[PDB]
């Protein structure tokens, strides 16, 4: 979590 | 696929303002938070802070309070970072993103 | 805030060499670290999230390691294509950037 990482 | 697209590199004086556009597109732009990154000449990066693309909420970094705007163009999904009565220390290239970044901004201030 | 020192700031490893690069926090980051990879005019590429999670199509060359406040990243095979400098950066609170780390591929 914390808004860093999955976009793709 | 995603891709972020910088408006080009700019010149501009002590004193004055500039505004930097941020294009989005490939994914959905309110659901992930737009970080603001800068890298002066010959040094790391260093981060500036975020835009809550949903509320429009920016959170500066301590170095980056004042002259420095974050703001969006949601229908567009397009960010924007405007920086006020530039300082030659601003001379940098700036990137916008988080998982995925845009190409850079290069910002020369000069007279 | 959450100062993060990396090191080496200049790495030297000949092509097919297994490379590493630490991180270490000023305190507990709890495994909220990422690994960037910047190449002279393009934007960053996020590699590794979460101390350990590779993003989509990075290749399985790269990984990383740690917790609390010690982390690594390595190159399993140093290739042409990683010339580049390298990046931490805590999300544990707020953000903080590593002072990165250059490389120099010997070949």
């Known amino acids: 979590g914390r808004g860093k990482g999955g976009k793709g | 696929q995603i891709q972020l697209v910088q408006s080009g590199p700019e010149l501009k004086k002590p004193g004055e303002t500039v505004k930097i556009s941020c294009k989005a597109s490939?994914?959905?732009?309110?659901?992930?938070?737009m970080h603001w990154v800068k890298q002066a000449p010959g040094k790391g990066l260093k981060w500036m802070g975020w835009?809550?693309?949903?509320?429009?909420?920016?959170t500066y970094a301590d170095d980056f309070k004042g002259r420095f705007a974050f703001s969006l163009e949601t229908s567009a999904t397009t960010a924007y970072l405007q920086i006020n009565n530039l300082k030659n220390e601003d001379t940098a290239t700036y990137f916008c993103?988080?998982?995925?970044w845009g190409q850079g901004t290069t910002l020369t201030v000069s007279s | 805030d959450i100062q993060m020192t990396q090191s080496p700031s200049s790495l030297s490893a000949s092509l097919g060499d297994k490379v590493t690069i630490t991180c270490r926090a000023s305190?507990?980051?709890?495994?909220?670290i990422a690994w960037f990879q910047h190449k002279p005019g393009k934007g960053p590429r996020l590699l590794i999230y979460?101390?350990?999670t590779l993003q989509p199509g990075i290749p399985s060359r790269f990984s990383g390691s740690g917790s609390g406040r010690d982390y690594s990243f390595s190159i399993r095979n140093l290739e042409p294509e990683d010339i580049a400098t390298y990046y931490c950066?805590?999300?544990?609170?707020?953000?903080?950037f590593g002072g990165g780390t250059k490389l120099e591929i010997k070949r």
């Open positions: 835009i809550n693309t949903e509320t429009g909420e920016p």
């Open positions: 993103g988080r998982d995925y």
């Open positions: 305190q507990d980051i709890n495994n909220y």
């Open positions: 490939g994914y959905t732009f309110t659901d992930y938070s």
């Open positions: 950066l805590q999300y544990d609170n707020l953000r903080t």
């Open positions: 979460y101390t350990s």
